[PDB]
Structures are given as C-alpha cells and as structure tokens.
Amino acid sequence: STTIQQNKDTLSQIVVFPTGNYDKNEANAMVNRLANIDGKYLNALKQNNLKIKLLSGKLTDEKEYAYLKGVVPKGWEGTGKTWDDVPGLGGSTVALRIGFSNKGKGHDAINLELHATAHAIDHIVLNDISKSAQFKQIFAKEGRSLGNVNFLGVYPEEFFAESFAYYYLNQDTNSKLKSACPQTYSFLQNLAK
C-alpha cells in the first residue's frame, strides 16, 4: 500500500502526459498499473531519465518516431500493419497511446504499458539481460509456453517483456506465469531481490 504510493511518486517523475485533450482518467489508470512494478526498477528508470510518454495520437505523429512511418515492426511481418498503427513502443524510450492498454486494442500483449516498460527495463536498467546466456537457456525451454510462439517463442527480449508484464500486472497473471513458466517466474523473482 505505502509502497504503491511510493511507486506512484516515482512515476510522477517519469510519466509525461500529452499536450491537449486526452483521457485523464485512463492515463491515471495506466500509471496505477505501472505502479505495480517493483520500485527498484522504477527508481532505476527515474535515475536514467527515462520518460514514459503517454500519447493521444499515433506514435509516428511524434517527431522522434516519424522515421518509423511505414516500417513494419520486428515480428509484425504479415499483419499488414506498420509502426503508424502500433499503440506502444519500448526500449531506449517508451511511448504509449492512452486507451490501448488491454489485449486486443491493436495488439495482443497482456498489457501495453507493462510490456513496453519491461523492454525499457530490460534494455536500460538490466543491460539486455533477456539476451544473456542465463535467460536464453530459460527462453529455450519455456519461451513457447505463453502462446504467440511465432513472437514470444522466437525473440527472447519479447518473452522477457511479456513475462515481466504477467508477473506485475495483477495476481491472476502472476499465477498464470508461475504455472506456465516456473523457471522464468523464479528468474524474475530473484531479479527483484
């Protein structure tokens, strides 16, 4: 409880709200879901000046992502979609369209903002641990146990980011991850120690 509040305070120094009109209540809801991430990761994002940019329009309408216009994202071959159509981006930066959090809103992630921020934590905070020998060994065994095996089962950074989202979204998804991917669950549990 008190830690959730602390995590919301840290996020207040990371989240950037869009200019102009936007769904203020849903933006708060996205922040609240992000506040379930372990404070150690949130503090490290804050320390690295990582901004979580919430958007009211397309990602590629932003100046820093205009270069992605027409580009088909990794693993999105055959969808007929380009970055212009994608509601979230993670890695060295984070940009998220408000209202598109849930599975089915232009994506099939368990949660948009947790998947994207997980990739920023992987890349910025954990120095691409998803591509380390230890996680590759876990990915080889359990990478195909969360579905979407042509995406999660092929890119270890994507399996990491989606598993991280399962771990932190809520108690239900946390339980599902432990049952499907026990080694991954233990790996994430030790990472937060």
Binding site: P87, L89, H123, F151
Partner: peptide
C-alpha cells in the same frame, strides 16, 4: 532500441 507489443 525500439520494440513493439505482441502482434
């Protein structure tokens, strides 16, 4: 580095 959500 940029990565998308699950398709």
């Amino acid at each position: 580095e940029v990565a998308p959500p699950v398709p």
